DNA sequence: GCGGCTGTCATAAG
DNA sequence: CAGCTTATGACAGCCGCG
């Protein structure tokens, strides 16, 4: 009932737009849009558009583009404001969609692909397109078919039909296992030539031309690939038909490393998965193949078949398609439970914007704030040049490297945007300077009030308090959307510790699933059910639970992830409301707060608990505090709660009733202090954490700024049936850690926290012993591989050579020769192995790309010349030897004179 | 050759 | 190629040390 775009495009003077109307159908316009923009006029003149500070603006209205940008460049070269959207296409939807955007996701067609291409000449480079493609897989989001594209003859060798007979039956049997929840709905055509499988690919693609465009790789290898492949066999005319309007643009991505490049359609929205999962994922991987991500995130098996790709085709073409098949599946698996397209969508609609600008925060806010003036018939400043200054950020605590037994955190819910929401900085807001105290005064309270009638910053800053400012208002509004996302996160969590406290102890019958939403709190009636329900049943049900839980994680991560990129705009120079007043003024007053309660927390409990001088808090890092319950528990002795939970139950309830409370008027205070305009300092109870009850175990410690870990029972509200370790900074959380090692180092964690010094030394023992024996990718350290180039000296290691490009230099001379060996590629990471003195390798590391097995070219020599010694030492030992220091521990038994007895 | 030390890098925590 | 700062540890190259 309500019309809304699909897409949105300038090339001269026209605009042109996807969009489907108040009926339900996709159609295309071209306009020729007459833009506005402002410059500064005097009081004399009727007018009724300001500036953001109230200053009378005159609008100017241009016949097209062409005339008005020429303007504001003759304009900022006489030097003087040229105000206003510049960014054409912005201002357009936004007079296009006068109103919030109720999107519909079942009109917008989505689309995701896979293509194959054979090439012994090794990788197949997509701006040369020198091989032909033999397979395409094209999901459509409305026919909801996979549409394969199968070649048959190509001048490497001539095959038969690919049979969804064969395709659907077991692995066991000799088929491919293709999913059948599928298997109906794939549509197969086969191809005598190339040519042909692609003119009626082509033609198809007209048919059903895509919005959003997606896969894995897709903006790097399948699209450009693709549209080279046509450009070199039908001209570059016909290849440009790949473009609902016939525009394509080479799109050149230039680091501080190299320059690569893709192939813009103008038109389409392509937003790549690997693009889409590595910003919204919030996991760090070793391997970003679909391989390595399927595996992580839809538990599935390794996709297996037997010789090379490149010789795939040739020897088995039934495995080839169906591989080509299922890839495409499951990049809809991992959407289907991250919802990471649906996100894109939700987010590039609240803010009017083209859907590949939610990778942009500087250009999502800028329409957001933008949007918001609008209405408020205001006028947004201009664009400015900046030089890159460095400014002040938060305050970590310097926490004695100790171990800490019984621990409960606090955390502020969401402190920088609440911080602009509180003290209301934006860049219309602001009111003038103070001469500042140093800032320690300030947290003390010792130094004057800052001012009696403006809201204050410690960084000497002055704002408005009747006056609404933009960024605090748009702000808000988000916040909301994350504060509502994340209550249906943590209530699919909670619900998550009813249905693991039942597979304690379950049932058996041939019921079904109970059909209840999982966004909320499991009631009364609904519990007692599950006491019965069948084991099969509640497991189907727990899945479904944690895939609510994870729908959670993103909506409410990423929406706090748009809240502090908000304030990472504030100091990014090419960001339009730029402006190192304001962004210094959150970080200071974040960094006030924090010791501000610091101080006040540790004068709260001495009082409480009688001693005078006491350090309550041992940690804290930017917004967080963390608290030692020791003298507390000893205070009522230990020797009274009947089980683990009773004194859990006992410090949440505690924490409730009679800390935040005195927290709450202690915060208070400090609004007061600094004159804010509202109060919104939230500080909530986060983790639980201790040992188990009547166990020799330490429960947790740090071993400096950003490392530590706890063993924790309840994490805000959601109480666990099962410890859950909370391991932050330490190794067992870096991705560049071995596999095998992380889960090891976990277990000695585990052990030390849970089962004390005893229960370590022994797992340490056996973790050595059975070192040797662990599959060697499993024991490979990982890295990214970064400026190849810059290091490499004719093969060699230059000045200044980092271990792991040593390991990848001396990859590449043992494979120098023949091409077939996977290469390693300038910015993707890789598996990195210690080799022993006197190897026939140059060095004593070897490096290869993370994901695959090495080649059989260099493998049987490398496990031979494996380093273990200095792999367990690297890697296991020395992360090690850093907890138990810290903790005061041994992880093995220092001799001693006991030591000569016979057993 | 071993031991601080600063610097490039990779990758974490906010 | 896509907001911000703060902070760690692995490792290479430099420098003092009968
Ligand atoms: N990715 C980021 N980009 C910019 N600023 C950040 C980021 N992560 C953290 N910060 C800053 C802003 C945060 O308010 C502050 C502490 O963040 P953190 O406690 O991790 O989340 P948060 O306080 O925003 O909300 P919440 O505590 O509800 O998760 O540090
Ligand atoms: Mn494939
Ligand atoms: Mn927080
Ligand atoms: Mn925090």
């Known amino acids: 009932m309500k019309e809304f775009y699909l897409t949105v495009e300038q090339i001269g003077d026209s605009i ?256 790549d998965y690997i693009d889409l999962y590595k910003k919204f994922s919030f ?251 069948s084991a099969k049943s509640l497991n189907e049900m727990l899945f479904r639970a944690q895939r609510t839980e994870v729908a959670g994680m993103t909506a409410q991560i990423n929406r706090k992830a748009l809240i502090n990129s908000l304030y990472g705009a504030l100091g990014n120079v090419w960001f339009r409301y730029y402006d190192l007043r304001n962004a210094t003024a959150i970080t200071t007053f974040g960094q006030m707060a924090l010791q501000w309660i610091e101080r006040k927390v540790n004068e709260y409990l001495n009082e409480v608990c009688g001693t005078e001088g006491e350090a309550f808090v041992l940690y804290g890092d930017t917004d967080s505090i963390y608290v030692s319950a020791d003298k507390i528990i000893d205070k009522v002795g230990e020797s009274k709660f009947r089980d683990t939970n009773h004194w859990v139950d006992f410090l949440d309830k505690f924490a409730r009733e009679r800390m935040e409370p005195a927290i709450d008027r202690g915060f208070r205070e400090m609004c007061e202090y600094m004159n804010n305009k509202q109060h919104l300092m939230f500080m909530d109870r986060e983790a639980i954490a201790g040992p188990p009850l009547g166990s020799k175990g330490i429960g947790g410690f740090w071993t400096g700024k950003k490392r530590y870990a706890l063993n924790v029972w309840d994490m805000e509200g959601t109480r666990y049936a099962e410890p859950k370790l909370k391991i932050m900074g330490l190794e067992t959380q870096k991705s560049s850690t071995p596999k095998a090692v992380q889960k090891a180092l976990k277990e000695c964690i585990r052990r030390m926290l849970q089962e004390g010094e005893e229960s370590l030394q022994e797992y340490f023992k056996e973790f050595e012993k059975e070192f040797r024996q662990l599959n060697y990718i499993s024991i490979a350290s990982v890295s990214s591989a970064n400026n190849i180039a810059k290091y490499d000296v004719g093969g060699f290691p230059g000045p200044k050579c980092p271990f792991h490009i040593r390991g990848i230099l001396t990859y590449n001379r043992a494979i120098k020769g023949n091409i077939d060996a996977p290469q390693v590629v300038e910015g993707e990471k890789v598996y990195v192995l210690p080799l022993r003195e006197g190897n026939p390798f140059g060095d004593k590391c070897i490096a290869w790309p993370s994901g695959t097995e090495i080649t059989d070219l260099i493998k049987d020599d490398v496990l031979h010349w494996m380093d273990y010694t200095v792999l367990l030492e690297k890697t296991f030992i020395k992360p090690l030897e850093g907890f138990t220091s810290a903790a005061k521990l041994d992880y093995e038994k220092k001799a001693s004179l006991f030591d000569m007895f016979d057993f």
């Open 16 to 271: 042109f737009e996807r969009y489907i109307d108040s009926n339900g159908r996709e159609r295309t316009r071209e306009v020729e849009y007459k833009p506005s923009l402002f410059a500064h006029c005097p009081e004399s003149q009727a007018t009724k558009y300001f500036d953001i500070y109230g200053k009378p603006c005159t609008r100017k209205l241009f016949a097209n583009m062409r005339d008005a940008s020429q303007w504001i460049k003759r304009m900022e070269d006489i030097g003087l404001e040229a105000l206003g959207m510049d960014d054409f296409k912005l201002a357009y939807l936004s007079d296009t969609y006068n109103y919030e955007i109720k999107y519909d996701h079942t009109k917008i067609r989505v689309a995701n692909f896979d293509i194959e291409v054979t090439s012994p000449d090794g990788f197949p480079e997509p701006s040369q397109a020198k091989h032909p493609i033999d397979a395409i897989t094209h999901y459509d989001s409305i026919d909801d078919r996979f549409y394969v594209f199968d070649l048959l003859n190509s001048p490497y060798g001539n095959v038969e039909e690919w049979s969804i007979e064969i395709a659907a039956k077991l692995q066991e049997q000799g088929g491919d296992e293709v999913p059948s929840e599928i298997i109906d709905k794939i549509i197969y055509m086969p191809f005598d030539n190339e040519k042909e499988l692609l003119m009626e690919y082509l033609n198809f693609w007209q048919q059903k031309t895509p919005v959003i465009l997606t896969g894995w790789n897709v903006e790097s290898f399948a699209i450009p690939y693709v549209y080279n492949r046509i450009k070199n066999i039908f001209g570059e005319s016909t290849a440009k038909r790949l473009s609902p309007h016939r525009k394509t643009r080479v799109k050149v991505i230039e680091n501080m490393y190299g320059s690569r490049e893709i192939i813009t359609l103008f038109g389409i929205s392509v937003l």
């Open 283 to 533: 996991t760090n991987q070793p391997s970003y193949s679909l391989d390595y991500i399927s595996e992580f995130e839809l538990n599935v098996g390794k996709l297996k078949y037997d010789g090379p790709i490149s010789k795939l085709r040739e020897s088995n073409h039934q495995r080839y398609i169906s591989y080509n098949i299922i890839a495409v599946y499951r990049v809809l698996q991992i959407d289907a439970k991250r919802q990471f397209i649906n996100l894109s969508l939700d987010m590039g609609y609240y803010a009017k914007i083209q859907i590949q600008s939610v990778f942009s925060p500087i250009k999502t806010w800028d329409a957001i704030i933008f949007n918001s003036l609008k209405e408020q018939n205001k006028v947004i400043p201009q664009g400015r040049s900046h030089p890159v200054q460095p400014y002040p950020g938060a305050f970590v605590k310097e926490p004695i490297p100790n171990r800490y037994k019984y621990v409960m955190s606090f955390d502020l819910t969401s402190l920088y945007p609440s911080i602009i929401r509180q003290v209301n900085i934006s860049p219309e807001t602001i009111a003038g300077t103070f001469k500042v105290a140093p800032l320690h005064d300030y947290i003390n309270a010792v130094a004057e009030r800052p001012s009696d009638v403006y809201s204050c910053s410690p960084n000497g800053m002055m704002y408005y308090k009747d006056r609404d400012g933009v960024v605090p208002t748009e702000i808000t509004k988000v916040f909301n959307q994350r504060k509502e996302h994340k209550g249906y996160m943590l209530a699919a969590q909670r619900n998550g510790e009813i249905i693991k406290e039942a597979l304690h102890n379950p049932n058996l019958s041939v019921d079904e699933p109970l059909d209840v939403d999982y966004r909320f709190d499991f009631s009364d009636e609904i519990k007692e059910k599950i006491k019965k329900l």
